[PDB]
Design a protein around this ligand. Structure first.
Ligand SMILES: Nc1ncnc2c1ncn2[C@@H]1O[C@H](COP(=O)(O)OP(=O)(O)NP(=O)(O)O)[C@@H](O)[C@H]1O
Ligand SMILES: [Mg+2]
Ligand SMILES: [Mg+2]
Length: 329
């Protein structure tokens, strides 16, 4: 086949290539490359040029995906747009290999198990070490953004909130239950370690089966975390730059740090130790992906090019359109 075609998926309308066949939702769709017979994943960027925040993310997602190359990080097979000219170029689609299902769904159906949980987390971390060594920050590691196939292979998904690590980044980032405390206590100045926090909540969730810190709102999330990691010293919270965070932590009781083994019922000793090292409140003492991998937990399993880069709604739209057409499979 050749050309394009349109279809009613859920509530949305897609205009994929004629070759990509039999679409199925999972917004992302699972199609089949008519040319080979291999299942594929097609992601439609939802109105990417509806704002500057949306455009910026769309371009960042395309760009990082086009750059990164790792066995544990999703890759592009094709990227296209059914818009023939820059003038009416409203959207574009990303094509990645179908990876089975996401960790979130996988956990809802079945309980994992020691060997499995280890293998999966090892992979999250190699993928992370790569993304980080490359100077990139993910900002959204959660079960739903981690794909796992039949052979238990994993690939980190969704770079929609990712970017190149810098000193002062955008504040409201990471999905709440996987959001590290400093995203709020240290508004706009968190680091790549936030992704280690997310990996800890994720690893913790795989073991227990329950969400580790299920908070009602961003501030309440702090309380949920604190109930486990204890609260920081009172003199520290006094000097907090963020008013919102300072007031909240002030009214909050004075909680003590609980032993992790007391929470993780049937978890292993080394697993508890690693988690303890990943979920430390102090971003600095918090283990890195490299260090994480080096841990005795990953015993039975034990260089990169930094990403580089350089606006109006039409500037993002144009800069993006260029990166779409310059794609080589
Ligand atoms: N390559 C893939 N293979 C299999 N499933 C995939 C693949 N890419 C994405 N998915 C699925 O699509 C769902 C959402 O994908 P995602 O790339 O995170 O888009 P998103 O809509 O921006 N998600 P989010 O911002 O977290 O709400 C995932 O939970 C997976 O089921
Ligand atoms: Mg997702
Ligand atoms: Mg996204």
């Amino acid at each position: 086949r050749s050309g394009f075609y349109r279809q009613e998926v859920t509530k949305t309308a897609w205009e994929v290539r004629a070759v990509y066949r039999d679409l199925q939702p999972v917004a992302v769709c699972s199609a089949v490359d008519g040319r080979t017979g291999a299942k594929v994943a097609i992601k439609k960027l939802y109105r990417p040029f509806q704002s500057e925040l949306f455009a910026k993310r769309a371009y960042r997602e395309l760009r990082l995906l086009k750059h990164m190359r790792h066995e544990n990080v999703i890759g592009l097979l094709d990227v296209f747009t059914p818009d023939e000219t820059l003038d009416d170029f409203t959207d574009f689609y990303l094509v990645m290999p179908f990876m089975g299902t996401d960790l979130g769904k996988l956990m809802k159906h079945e309980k994992l198990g020691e060997d499995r949980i280890q293998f999966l987390v090892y992979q999250m971390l190699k993928g992370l070490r790569y993304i980080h060594a490359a100077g990139i920050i993910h900002r959204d590691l959660k079960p739903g953004n981690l794909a796992v196939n039949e052979d238990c292979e994993l690939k980190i998904l969704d770079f929609g909130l990712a970017r190149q690590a810098d000193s002062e980044m955008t504040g409201y980032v990471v999905t709440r239950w996987y959001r590290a405390p400093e995203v709020i206590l240290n508004w706009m100045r968190y680091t790549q370690t936030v992704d280690i926090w997310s990996v800890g909540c994720i690893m913790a969730e795989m073991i227990t089966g329950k969400t580790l810190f299920k908070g009602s709102d961003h501030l309440d999330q702090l309380k949920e975390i604190m109930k486990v990691t204890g609260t920081p010293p009172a003199e520290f919270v006094q000097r907090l730059q963020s008013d919102e965070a300072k007031n909240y932590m002030k009214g909050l009781p004075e909680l003590e740090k609980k032993d992790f083994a007391s929470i993780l019922t049937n978890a292993s000793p080394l697993a508890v130790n690693l988690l303890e090292k990943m979920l430390v409140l102090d971003a600095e003492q918090r283990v890195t992906a490299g260090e994480a991998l080096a841990h005795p937990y990953f015993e039975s399993l034990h260089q990169v090019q930094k990403y580089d880069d350089s606006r109006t709604l039409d500037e993002w739209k144009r800069v993006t359109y260029k990166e779409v057409l310059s794609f080589k499979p």
